[PDB]
Amino acid sequence: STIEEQAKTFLDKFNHEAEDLFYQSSLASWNYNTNITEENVQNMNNAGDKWSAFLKEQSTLAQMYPLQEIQNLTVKLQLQALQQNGSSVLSEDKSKRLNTILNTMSTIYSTGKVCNPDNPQECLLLEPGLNEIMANSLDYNERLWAWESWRSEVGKQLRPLYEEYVVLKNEMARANHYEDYGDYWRGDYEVNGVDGYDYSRGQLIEDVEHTFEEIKPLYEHLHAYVRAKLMNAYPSYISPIGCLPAHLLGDMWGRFWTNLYSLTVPFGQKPNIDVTDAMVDQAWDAQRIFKEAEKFFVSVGLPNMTQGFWENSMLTDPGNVQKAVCHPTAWDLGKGDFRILMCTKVTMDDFLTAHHEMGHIQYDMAYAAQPFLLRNGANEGFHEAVGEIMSLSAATPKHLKSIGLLSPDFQEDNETEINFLLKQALTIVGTLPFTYMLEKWRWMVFKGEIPKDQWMKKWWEMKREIVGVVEPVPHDETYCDPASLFHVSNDYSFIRYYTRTLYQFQFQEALCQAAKHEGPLHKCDISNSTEAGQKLFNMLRLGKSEPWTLALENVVGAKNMNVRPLLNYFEPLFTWLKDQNKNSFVGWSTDWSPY
Amino acid sequence: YNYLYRLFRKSNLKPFERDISTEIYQAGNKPCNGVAGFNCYFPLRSYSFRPTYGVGHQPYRVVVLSFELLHAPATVCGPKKSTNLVKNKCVNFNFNGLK
Ligand SMILES: *[C@@H]1O[C@H](CO)[C@@H](O)[C@H](O)[C@H]1NC(C)=O
Ligand SMILES: *[C@@H]1O[C@H](CO)[C@@H](O)[C@H](O)[C@H]1NC(C)=O
Ligand SMILES: *[C@@H]1O[C@H](CO)[C@@H](O)[C@H](O)[C@H]1NC(C)=O
Ligand SMILES: *[C@@H]1O[C@H](CO)[C@@H](O)[C@H](O)[C@H]1NC(C)=O
Ligand SMILES: *[C@@H]1O[C@H](CO)[C@@H](O)[C@H](O)[C@H]1NC(C)=O
Ligand SMILES: *[C@@H]1O[C@H](CO)[C@@H](O)[C@H](O)[C@H]1NC(C)=O
Cα B34 → chain centroid: 30
Of A13, A20, A312, the CB nearest to B52: A312
- CA distances (Å), A467 to each of A470, A481, B45, in order? 9, 15, 56
Nearest to A525 by CA among A404, A408, A401: A401
**Hey, what's the torsion of the CAs at A49, A50, A54, A56, to 10 degrees?**
20
Calpha distance B85→A119 (Å, rounded): 104
**Residue numbers preceding breaks in chain A (C to N > 2.5 A):** none
A363 contacts: CB under 8 Å, gap ≥ 6? A377, A382, A383, A386, A387, A540
CA separation for the pair A130, A144 (Å, rounded): 12
**Cβ neighbours of residue A551 under 8 Å, at least 6 residues apart?**
A378, A382, A539, A542
Q: Is B73 on the interface with A (CB under 8 A)?
A: no
CA angle A539–A210–A442, rounded 5-degree value: 90
Helix (H) or strand (E) holding B6: strand B4-6
CA–CA separation, A486 and A313 (whole Å): 28
| Pairs from B9-12 (Cβ < 8 Å, separation ≥ 24) | B9/B43
Neighbours of A264 (CB within 10 A): 23
Contacts of B41 in chain A (CB under 8 A): 9, 13
Tell me the residue length of chain B.
99
Q: Which atom of ligand 1 is closest in space to residue A322's alpha carbon?
A: 1
Secondary structure class of A439 (helix, strand, coil): helix
Whole-number Å distance between alpha carbons of A492 and A486: 8
Asked if B55 has any chain A CB less than 8 Å from its own CB, the reply is yes
User: What torsion, rounded to 10 degrees, do the Cα atoms A200, A203, A204, A210 define?
Assistant: -150
Query: Which residue from A502, A510, A542 is spatially nearest to A526, judged by alpha carbons?
Result: A510
Please tell me the number of the ligand nearest to residue A411's CA. 5
Q: What is Dmax (Cα atoms) for chain A? A: 79
Number of other residues whose CB lies within 10 A of the CB of residue A87: 16
Give the residue from A335, A338, A339 with the most B CB atoms within 10 Å of its CB, the best one to mutate: A335
Q: How many CB atoms lie within 10 A of CB A571?
A: 15
Q: Which residues of A536-558 are buried (b: 16+ CB within 10 A; e: fewer)?
A: bbebbbbbbbbbbbbbbbbbbee
Neighbours of A479 (CB within 10 A): 21
Burial code (b: 16+ CB inside 10 Å, e: under 16) for A43-69 equals: bbeebeeebeebbeebbeebeebebee
Tell which atom from ligand 2 comes closest to the C-alpha of A74: 1
In DSSP terms, A199 is beta-bridged to A191
Rounded Cα–Cα distance for residues A194 and A552 (Å)? 14
One-letter amino acid identity for A117? P
**Cα–Cα distance between A521 and A503 in angstroms, integer?**
15
User: Cα Rg for chain B, rounded, in angstroms?
Assistant: 27
Task: Give, to the nearest 10 degrees, the angle between helix A3-34 and helix A73-82.
Answer: 50
Instruction: Pick the catalytic residue from A357, A380, A439, A509.
Output: A357
Instruction: Tell me which method was used to determine the 3D structure.
Output: cryo-EM
DSSP code of A367?
Answer: G
Contact A479, A156 (CB under 8 A): yes
CA distances from A421 to A43, A426, A576 (A): 46, 9, 11
Q: What distance in Å separates residue B15's CA from the closest CA in chain A? A: 24
10 Å Cβ neighbour count for A497?
22
Rounded-to-integer distance, Cα B24 and Cα B40, Å: 6
Disruptive mutation site among B30, B47, B48 for chain A (greatest number of A CBs within 10 Å): B48
A430 DSSP assignment: T
3-state SS assignment for residue A236: coil
Ligand nearest to C-alpha A299: 6
Contacts of A1 in chain B (CB under 8 A): 29
By CB neighbour count within 10 A (0-12 exposed, 13-18 middle, 19+ buried), where does A194 fall? middle
- The beta strands (E) that lie in A306-449 are given as 329-334, 337-341
Contact call for residues A439 and A459 (beta carbons, < 8 A): no
Resolution in A: 2.5
Q: How far apart are CA A194 and CA A172, in angstroms?
A: 28
Among the residues of A234-345, which ranges form H helices?
276-281, 286-299, 307-312
| B55 with A6: Cβ contact below 8 A | no
Q: Is A247 annotated as a binding residue?
A: no
Q: Which residues pair with A419 in a beta bridge?
A: none
Question: Given an 8 Å threshold on Cβ–Cβ distance, is B55 in contact with A10?
Answer: no
Q: How far apart are the first and last CA of chain B?
A: 58
Task: Report how far residue A166's alpha carbon sits from residue A186's, in angstroms, rounded to the nearest whole number.
Answer: 16
